Amino acid sequence: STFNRIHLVVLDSVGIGAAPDANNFSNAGVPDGASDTLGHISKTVGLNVPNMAKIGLGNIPRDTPLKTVPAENHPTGYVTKLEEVSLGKDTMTGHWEIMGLNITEPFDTFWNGFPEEIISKIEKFSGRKVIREANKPYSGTAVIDDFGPRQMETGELIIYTSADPVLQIAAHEDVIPLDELYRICEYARSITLERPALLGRIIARPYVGKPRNFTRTANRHDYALSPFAPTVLNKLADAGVSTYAVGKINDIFNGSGITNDMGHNKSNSHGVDTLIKTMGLSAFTKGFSFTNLVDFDALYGHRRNAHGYRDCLHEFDERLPEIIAAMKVDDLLLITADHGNDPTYAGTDHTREYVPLLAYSPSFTGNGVLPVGHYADISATIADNFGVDTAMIGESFLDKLI
């Protein structure tokens, strides 16, 4: 194995400009072809990311340069941008492709709530009406505050969603028995396996308490889809190669091919702490770490907050030298994203964009820019490095790094 360890960090949603097929995707009816997460942030609120620029962020080919991220004539790493092949721009699709799958049946998202077929089906199975005013994207903690009292009186189901392909059912334990909530969720899981209702995850959300003061209970159950084919995580795990997960990674893959889940992040910074700790483990002598830093997407992209997005990027850039200081000489660091989420754009959804790829190792004997590639080339490079099979798609760029 050329690199003894590889650390892949996903800056969730950090796109670097509309993809060739961007107009096949949209935001509140507006096609994605004008989106440009990094570029639009830079030209509106500014963007100071000297540590990523030094690796070569400003060397990645673009029609027009990042306004405030200059090219670097003496870069320390290799950079390029990667194009998504899968027909979805959601988080699960992007990560699964980064690990080598080609998703041609993209998960459905429901900005206007679940269709009548799904709701009507669940209503008939459960014998309970669904509260239609709650069938829409909704803070899980606010929907319970808003319709909890009603549910306590009527026993109606509260079914809601998020920006993700997720269906959640909140049900007060006093009026809706756990056993029943689970059966309903299982039935729900069974009728959402194909488009136009393909759901990544069904979540039972039991809760207790009283009006204006509710508490979610540990009786939560999840019903998630695993990758439909072995990914490079499976290839590594099957070969006895360690796979460490940080952040949303375990959830996204439903644990498939993950030997060491380090758990959810409290925040990006707490995630970077956890990655640094993981890198320092005496047991972690060989293998792969896979970290998702989600704040860019959840707090800033979806909320169309460019100022905050900028700050979040700056704060990651400030911590990047800590990650690098913790690398062994024969470690490789890869930084990328899973789609865009342009905070200057119409809508409040992800945007179909190229994603940056930054590559760094102290053992590098060269630097510069790689040919533009595809998401799954990341998986193939990792597979190549550890001498395991590729999954569905992807081509290694390992030979360019050595």
Ligand SMILES: [Mn+2]
């Ligand atoms: Mn994402």
Ligand SMILES: [Mn+2]
């Ligand atoms: Mn998102």
